[PDB]
């Protein structure tokens, strides 16, 4: 369903269980930081 | 902002210092599948409109 759920399954398919969660947390922190730094130009590149 | 989920995960896996047990190509291929990439694109659009308000 939601993308974090999709991603969680993919990572569990390619990483050890411990690694998969760590990648997913890092991915979310990275994602969160990119939202905090969002500009109008970023939006316009969608 | 990374547009491609495969690129965001590659950068996150390196930052976390985690290597796939399959291969980085198999992981990217999986994340580049149209459905999962579009789900990522739609989530991003949603979150951007959340930032915008």
Curated annotation (Swiss-Prot), chain A:
A cellular component annotation (GO) from this entry: cytoplasm
GO biological process: post-translational protein targeting to endoplasmic reticulum membrane; protein modification process; regulation of protein stability; tail-anchored membrane protein insertion into ER membrane; ubiquitin-dependent protein catabolic process
Function: As part of a cytosolic protein quality control complex, the BAG6/BAT3 complex, maintains misfolded and hydrophobic patches-containing proteins in a soluble state and participates in their proper delivery to the endoplasmic reticulum or alternatively can promote their sorting to the proteasome where they undergo degradation. The BAG6/BAT3 complex is involved in the post-translational delivery of tail-anchored/type II transmembrane proteins to the endoplasmic reticulum membrane.
Entry's Gene Ontology molecular function annotations: protein-folding chaperone binding; ubiquitin-like protein transferase activity
Localization, UniProt: Cytoplasm, Cytosol; Nucleus
Consequence recorded when altering residue 13 to E: No effect on interaction with BAG6
Effect the entry attributes to changing residue 14 to E: Strongly inhibits interaction with BAG6
Stretch of the intact protein here: 93 to 138 of 157
Region (Required and sufficient for interaction with BAG6) location: 4-46
Keywords of the record: Cytoplasm, Isopeptide bond, Nucleus, Phosphoprotein, Transport, Ubl conjugation
Species for this entry: Homo sapiens
Record PTM text: Polyubiquitinated. Ubiquitination by AMFR and deubiquitination by USP13 may regulate the interaction between the BAG6/BAT3 complex and SGTA and therefore may regulate client proteins fate.
Keyword set includes Chloroplast: no
Quaternary structure and partners: Component of the BAG6/BAT3 complex, at least composed of BAG6, UBL4A and GET4/TRC35. Interacts with BAG6; the interaction is direct and required for UBL4A protein stability. Interacts with USP13; may be indirect via BAG6.
Effect of residue 10 to E/K: No effect on interaction with BAG6
Protein name: Ubiquitin-like protein 4A
Keyword Ubl conjugation: yes
Curated annotation (Swiss-Prot), chain B:
Subcellular localization, as worded in the UniProt entry: Cytoplasm, Cytosol; Nucleus; Secreted, Extracellular exosome
Posttranslational modification: Ricin can induce a cleavage by the caspase CASP3. The released C-terminal peptide induces apoptosis.
Ranges for region BAG-similar domain, required and sufficient for interaction with UBL4A: 2-53
Biased composition, class Low complexity, residue ranges: 8-18
Residue numbers of Phosphoserine PTMs: 23
Reported tissue expression: Expressed by immature dendritic cells (at protein level).
Highest taxon of source: Eukaryota
The record's note on its domains: The ubiquitin-like domain mediates interaction with the E3 ubiquitin-protein ligase RNF126 which is responsible for the BAG6-dependent ubiquitination of client proteins. SGTA also binds this domain and competes with RNF126 to antagonize client protein ubiquitination and degradation. The ubiquitin-like domain also mediates the interaction with USP13.
UniProt function note: ATP-independent molecular chaperone preventing the aggregation of misfolded and hydrophobic patches-containing proteins. Functions as part of a cytosolic protein quality control complex, the BAG6/BAT3 complex, which maintains these client proteins in a soluble state and participates in their proper delivery to the endoplasmic reticulum or alternatively can promote their sorting to the proteasome where they undergo degradation. The BAG6/BAT3 complex is involved in the post-translational delivery of tail-anchored/type II transmembrane proteins to the endoplasmic reticulum membrane.
Subunit text: Component of the BAG6/BAT3 complex, also named BAT3 complex, at least composed of BAG6, UBL4A and GET4/TRC35. Interacts with GET4; the interaction is direct and localizes BAG6 in the cytosol. Interacts with UBL4A; the interaction is direct and required for UBL4A protein stability. Interacts with AIFM1. Interacts with HSPA2. Interacts with CTCFL. Interacts with p300/EP300. Interacts (via ubiquitin-like domain) with RNF126; required for BAG6-dependent ubiquitination of proteins mislocalized to the cytosol. (Microbial infection) Interacts with L.pneumophila Lpg2160 and LegU1 proteins.
Name of the protein this chain belongs to: Large proline-rich protein BAG6
Taxonomic path: Eukaryota, Metazoa, Chordata, Craniata, Vertebrata
Residues included from the entire protein: 1060 to 1111 of 1132
């Amino acid at each position: 369903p939601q993308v974090w759920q999709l991603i969680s399954k993919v990572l569990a398919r390619h990483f050890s269980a411990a690694d998969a969660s760590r990648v997913l947390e890092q991915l979310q922190r990275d994602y969160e930081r990119s939202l905090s730094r969002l500009t109008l130009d970023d939006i316009e590149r969608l | 902002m990374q547009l491609l989920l495969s690129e965001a995960v590659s950068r996150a896996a390196k930052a976390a210092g985690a290597r796939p047990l399959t291969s980085p190509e198999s992981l990217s291929r999986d994340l580049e599948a149209p459905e999962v990439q579009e789900s990522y694109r739609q989530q991003l659009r949603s979150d951007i409109q959340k930032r915008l308000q």
